[PDB]
């Protein structure tokens, strides 16, 4: 447990509770187990319940609900308490020049105003620093805590809202927009709470400072105020210009995010198609405009950030010269004026615009989140009592809100214990009918009445990340008899037994470990397990062979649940013979409704590697340093004309300030560095081996492409520039001041060496906890992605609270990782402040017990601390560059085809190294121009063989076509001889023409010819733009029977002499399969296809069969030869 729960007031004030973890992490590795727990204040379950109540009251009471009016009622008073503490701690910063000016008047020659007083003031001056230190840091920590609490509460509200979104609203929502929204205010929201209080402190500080200065300059104190007001107007005009270049980049960032995620999810098909070259350019073109906007917005921000270092001369000039004209000036007042003007310049030009910008951004983010919260919701409205019968009459529905209806005049009725089987050609609307039943689709006319309890089995299998037992159970009480019977009747015995961990293995997001014929079985078992009234199954036997389908239908759909009503999407005749009713849709219309009899009768090392990527960075750093060398040599050897050099030193901020000749090129180069880094990282990811790529997850990519690159684009340039500016200011003033007085320069050496040693000591833990928390924010992303993916099988089942609890657990883990760093960085900053005051209690006290050397020592000892803080910020930010380089440094896996004859010798396929060998000593041959038909059971390894042909997985054999082996040619040129049709169809966000070919090498005539040949003429032309419609949501507009057709058209367009057909027809009806056959015969009359289809009527157009069994291949010749040994395959 965290010690903050049980800690004394002084212990919490000194933050001394991070000492044990810091000591452990400095000399040992930090592990998740040895991490402080979470308290009861930061728990999401309570921190969201405290806000949902207020939000609901606002929604039900007000006429114009506001989220800020609900956040105020919770986090107002603590925020105001820390604001008051901040104001009290900052009032003590404008009165420090007053004490220096009332000390200097004492060490004025021959016994000036007060003589026996310097003892009183020389101690109180530095003792006031202790009070400032005590008052400042706790308020900052409290404000950070409040910001983090608001962030987690709003995130939980967003997740609770995102599970009630309608199907209509999901059209405009992409898996990239939400990720970008989270990544924006994931860490820049809670950090800005401290800066938000400087909107009412800066004016009061300005008023107090003006009142103080007026006692020095009678009426000349207002010219400097006028100049500073003009500068503040200029900065406020720069802010609005910067905003315009920030609200246009978000859309491009989201678009790039969705395209990158869609590519990385199924990089397998990209590699098979050899689309990497044409798909890196598609991202580079998008990145160009983002870079242009970022480069335009990184100059205005620099100009805003450089108005403090270029204002320390004009303000002093305008303050002193008008008064010096009428009365001259004294060398005592001319320094108190500068000491006041420094604080005034900071509070006007650095603290006010930052607060204004923070308020603007916070209000904008809150309003955006409120707009997300106020969207259309999904209603159920069903009745929980009936006669256990499902009847709907005269239902007509439109998918799009506006167009052609999808369903019209469909009526049916089924009692309890009956089975209704629906069928029809592709595009008829069977899935839409089941959606109408489920309620995810609102009919425009009609009514559906049935009991609420239903069970769903989607056409596309869904595998949430967890054990097989958890996947099958799906958040209910575990059973031993029902579960075992289901697992036996769904044919999941042998496949589960093959695993080393028998039942509870681990499956990743999407079930990549499992094949395509076992995910369907798991989904069917999950649907069967649930105790519901109606089991609406949407074509469960999609990726199952004929024998498995026959064995499952008679033992799971008619023997296990033969007393509960179930609606099945059929595509065969044996499934209709045993049916109780039949409904044959056609183009969204009830073509038939009746029984089968009537149907029959009817018819360190990162900094050096970061700057050396681009040579212009070195050529600009040398140019920005040698000019500083000349500038500092124009203030050390030209002094023989003067010797009052203290006044000259006092304006070192303006003297050594970077202009627009040495800062603009550096800023411009620092973005080109990020561009090159991102391009190299994307290329190295695209050209990586599959064994290395499979280690990566779907949450480990949006955490490295969305936030990590955004850091390098946005935050690193200006932070590095500011740190460099502070370094130059400190060095070129300490070196100068070491000439006049070399005794006060001595004190700055031990301070610097202690600062560097302590910072390097604390980095030993901040470089392993910061990375821990930066990688610990991936679970929430990877759970949000899958919860959005399974949003239609979640609401149908009813398991919403289970996912809510999972998300709460993930949020708790992230906050537990975050609080430790948020506390240890504060501890180290406060200890730096303490060593500062400890080494400062002596410098003035011993020297006092010239009186103006004190103001220079105090103007240097604060710039040193500011530079130290900037260095800490840069070191914290460079972890992103470190992870970019880690992600780049990855292994690289990298007319001839006339006849197309094959030969394999001693082939071994294994997806991993040292794992189970899927294929062992494979050998066969293929006569050229001869079709070959693969065969086998589920889990045999057909797709494994097809992948081993293209060498996606590591192999140990040789395959040669037309006399050239594997080694004689490169992988990229070898892989171009094959035209594949992957089992997982790939559709990305783009136009139809772009999807059909990314390289854009075929004209619209050539595209239309193939589209009409395959049969997409009636599908492309039903959309507002033919061959120009922007398919989105992963091609969700199309249907499962049209996705396969488009994939086959893509295969036909690209002509190859060898092609690996991996189940060309997955869910196609028998009528549309004639199109597949008329394309196969008339377009593949010269190439040697390798079929994988499970259709018995399709397995007859072959000449050489390959059956995979027990990790070996047997090749037969006659069609009936292989159907005689095993009688099961013939009887089934
Ligand atoms: N990424 C992977 N890593 C390790 N093993 C895998 C991976 N993908 C699949 N397998 C294993 O491969 C075995 C069989 O190979 P594959 O997954 O290609 O199935 P298959 O027999 O071709 O499938 P089907 O006939 O159902 O389409 C499966 O039992 C599974 O354990
Ligand atoms: N989200 C959507 N928005 C707009 N139109 C859609 C959407 N989903 C499907 N459609 C279209 O509406 C019709 C309904 O097709 P649907 O997907 O219901 O067919 P199906 O019976 O499931 O077909 P299949 O044989 O491919 O499984 C099709 O013309 C399809 O292209
Ligand atoms: C924090 C703010 C609101 C407090 C009110 C403004 C303060 C800073 C201003 C208002 C009037 C000012 C005073 C006006 C006149 C004099 C008389 C002179 O012999 C010493 C300075 C002194 C005493 C000024 C000190 C600063 C002063 C007190
Ligand atoms: O509250 C804060 O964050 C805070 C408060 C105060 C400051 C002070 C600063 S910054 C800067 S530059 N100078 C300066 C100006 C002229 C000359 C010199 C010299 F002598 F060192 F060269 C240094 C300061 O005095 C920074 C931050
Ligand atoms: Mg379907
Ligand atoms: Mg397969």
Numbering used by the authors: 3 to 404, 437 to 637, 846 to 885, 915 to 1120, 1129 to 1173, 1203 to 1440
Article passage:
In the human body, the chloride channel Cystic Fibrosis Transmembrane conductance Regulator (CFTR) mediates chloride transport across the cell membrane in multiple epithelial-lining organs, including intestines, biliary ducts, pancreas ducts, respiratory airways, and sweat ducts. Topological analysis of CFTR places it in the ATP-binding Cassette (ABC) transporter family, which harnesses the energy from ATP hydrolysis to move substrates across cell membranes. Structurally, ABC proteins possess two transmembrane domains (TMDs) forming the substrate translocation pathway and two cytosolic nucleotide-binding domains (NBDs) that recruit and hydrolyze ATP as the energy source. Once the R domain is phosphorylated, ATP-binding induced NBD dimerization and subsequent hydrolysis of ATP in site 2 are coupled to the opening and closing of the CFTR pore, respectively.
We find that Inh-172 binds inside the pore of CFTR, interacting with amino acid residues from transmembrane segments (TMs) 1, 6, 8, 9, and 12 through mostly hydrophobic interactions and a salt bridge. The measured global RMSD between these two structures is 1.5 Å for all paired Cα with a smaller RMSD of 1.1 Å for all paired Cα in their NBDs, indicating the existence of some but limited global conformational changes upon Inh-172 binding to the E1371Q-CFTR and the preservation of a canonical NBD dimer in the Inh-172 bound state. Comparing the positions of the residues directly involved in the binding of Inh-172 between drug-free and drug-bound structures, we observed negligible changes of their positions with an RMSD of 1.1 Å. When the extracellular parts of CFTR’s two TMDs were aligned for the Inh-172 bound and Inh-172 free structures, it became clear that in the drug-bound structure, the extracellular segment of TM12 (from V1129 to L1143) wedges into the central axis for 30°, while extracellular segments of TM1 (from V93 to Y109) and TM8 (from T910 to L926) tilt away from the central axis for 10° and 13°, respectively, resulting in a closed pore conformation. The calculated RMSD for these three segments between the two structures is 4.3 Å.
